[PDB]
Design a binder for this molecule. Structure first.
Ligand code: BAK
Ligand code: CA
Ligand code: CL
Ligand code: ZN
Ligand code: ZN
Ligand code: ZN
Length: 223
């Protein structure tokens, strides 16, 4: 997250860190046995770490649980990143408390202008590399689909939306991938892609979760 702030320990209790020996992607807890992340974060051998703040220090509120199964969206296209969403089932149910909580799926899609909260442990430098150990946050508004499409001609589909600032300076970045974009108490997006990080007129592009609620509900009930 570039141009954001330190969230505060466990202030985003639904945020997860996907670890395969190191943190490589974020995710959101949707109920005690399932996590939603991005399909471009798919790997075999994932351990889900809940209640994290500093990912290099065990502070006492963590739960490390291995995944029993991963399900990449049937229509995920790795070249265009269309349908960039995947579900991860935990081997054991997580224990929900104040530090570990699930986030609600949306009942409708959010409007351009709505302010959201994006969080993650990804790179914090636009022109540089600095990976933080504690969770960073960023408040950003959903942009109109026209500014999103004019920034990425022929690359945005109906399953994606842009959020951020066209002036540059604030954005999610590599490492934040698969993590949450929460607007009005609902999970509306998943960190997917963008051009570099925090560049002017290159906002971040997010998976539009409201288009996948039936697929999510149907898949978790059958797995
Ligand atoms: N397991 C891997 N090998 C892997 C996982 C995630 C990755 N993610 C990128 C990436 O290259 C990448 N993820 C991004 C997310 C947001 C933005 C943004 N500017 N908003 C830019 C991004 N670039 N490479 C990745 C490789
Ligand atoms: Ca920790
Ligand atoms: Cl640790
Ligand atoms: Zn990359
Ligand atoms: Zn990524
Ligand atoms: Zn990139």
């Amino acid at each position: 997250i570039v141009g954001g702030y330190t969230c505060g320990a466990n202030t985003v209790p639904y945020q997860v860190s996907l670890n395969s020996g190191y943190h490589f992607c974020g995710g959101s807890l949707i109920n005690s046995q399932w996590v939603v992340s991005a399909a471009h974060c798919y790997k075999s051998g994932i351990q889900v770490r809940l209640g994290e703040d500093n990912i290099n220090v065990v502070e006492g509120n963590e739960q490390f649980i291995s995944a029993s199964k991963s399900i990449v969206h049937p229509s995920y296209n790795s070249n265009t990143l269309n349908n960039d969403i995947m579900l991860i089932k935990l081997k054991s149910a997580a224990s929900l408390n104040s530090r570990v909580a699930s986030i609600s799926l949306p009942t409708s899609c959010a409007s351009a202008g709505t302010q959201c909260l994006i969080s993650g442990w990804g790179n914090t430098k636009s022109s540089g590399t600095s990976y933080p150990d504690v969770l960073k946050c960023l408040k950003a508004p959903i942009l109109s689909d026209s500014s999103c499409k004019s920034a990425y001609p022929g690359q945005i589909t109906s399953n994606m939306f842009c959020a951020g600032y066209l002036e540059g300076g604030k954005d999610s970045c590599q490492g934040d991938s698969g993590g949450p974009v929460v607007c009005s108490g609902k999970l509306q997006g998943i960190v997917s892609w963008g051009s570099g990080c925090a560049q002017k007129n290159k906002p971040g592009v997010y998976t539009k979760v409201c288009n996948y609620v039936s697929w999510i509900k149907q898949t978790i009930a059958s797995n």
